[PDB]
Design a protein around this ligand. Structure first.
Ligand code: FE
Length: 329
């Protein structure tokens, strides 16, 4: 019993959140957990809000989970999304590089091309691809934003500083850090490529399938494999950049309501999980893609007692992120 203040980032998420609140009210008893919606302009305002006791929960891509863990925020992962199916839940997904068929370039010929990123600091859209290309970048590689802006001939990296690094917002003026920016997130990064703004889109394995329903339309796209070859979009298991940890809901370390957060989400997935309700869907919405939780998610799993961001993410991934921030070739 009692309120979980969910942090909605911008308009579309705020609308889905208010719908969430309302449908949970209709099914959950007077003594069950309820939802309140707090709207912020970016995921960063959400991390700050939670730390400052203005909100309680927000789902973050694993790469952002690391930053949220850092002081002075010190937030921790409490609930994780899982993909695949309820039968064989996957707590990881694949980072892939989508390109158009016959565009004539491999992963080793990305210099000078235009790039579409989900957002600065995110797993598939930034950490993995930029980590792999790091030494191919021109010195000085610090700041990273400058070396990246100089490698490609223009990009859309939502949440990046357009003032200091304009080329990083060339494909999406302003580098908006929410769904208000049409080239934000997985589906936004894919639109950026489909529209012809960029040459490559750093997204996950399900993105193209979530956007193009016909196989004939998807046959016009390919994946860049690490062995400097290309494979069709269905062969991502044999052509991906890396496997990354699933998105996770984070909360305060003190007075964080993690029990209530789990109680709310567990009930939520039961009533509004995949194929559960005709009235409301937790993992989809007429208002946009990946709002509050990823559309590709099938449910939630509780994170073990007192697990910190570092242990949750793993040694490898945390090293990848570290090596990107300082990093020596
Ligand atoms: Fe992600």
């Amino acid at each position: 019993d009692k309120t979980v203040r969910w942090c909605a980032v911008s308009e579309h998420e705020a609308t889905k959140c208010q719908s969430f609140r309302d449908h949970m009210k209709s099914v959950i008893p007077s003594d069950g957990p309820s939802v309140a919606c707090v709207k912020k302009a970016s995921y960063l305002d959400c991390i700050r809000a939670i730390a400052a006791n203005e909100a309680d929960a927000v789902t973050l891509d694993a790469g952002l989970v690391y930053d949220a863990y850092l002081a002075p925020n010190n937030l921790k992962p409490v609930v994780a999304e899982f993909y695949g199916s309820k039968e064989d839940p996957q707590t990881f997904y694949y980072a892939v590089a989508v390109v158009k068929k016959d565009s004539g370039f491999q992963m080793n010929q990305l210099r000078g091309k235009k790039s579409c990123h989900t957002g600065l600091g995110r797993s598939a859209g930034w950490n993995i691809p930029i980590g792999l290309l790091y030494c191919d970048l021109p010195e000085p590689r610090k700041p990273l934003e400058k070396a990246v802006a100089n490698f490609f001939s223009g990009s859309c990296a939502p949440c990046a500083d357009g003032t200091d690094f304009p080329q990083l917002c060339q494909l999406c003026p302003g580098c908006g850090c929410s769904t208000l920016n049409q080239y934000f997130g997985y589906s936004g990064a894919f639109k950026c490529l489909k529209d012809g703004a960029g040459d490559v889109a750093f997204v996950k394995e399900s993105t193209i399938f979530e956007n193009l329903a016909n196989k004939a339309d998807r046959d016009q796209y390919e994946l860049l494999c690490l062995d400097n070859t290309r494979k069709p979009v269905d062969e991502y298991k044999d052509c991906h950049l890396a496997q990354v940890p699933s998105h996770t809901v984070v909360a305060r370390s003190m007075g964080g309501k993690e029990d209530l957060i789990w109680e709310l989400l567990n009930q939520a997935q039961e009533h509004f999980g995949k194929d559960k309700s005709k009235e409301f869907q937790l993992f989809s919405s007429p208002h946009g893609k990946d709002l509050l939780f990823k559309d590709s998610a099938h449910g939630f799993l509780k994170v073990p007692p007192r697990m910190d961001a570092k242990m949750y993410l793993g040694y490898e991934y945390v090293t990848a992120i570290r090596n990107l921030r300082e990093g020596t070739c």
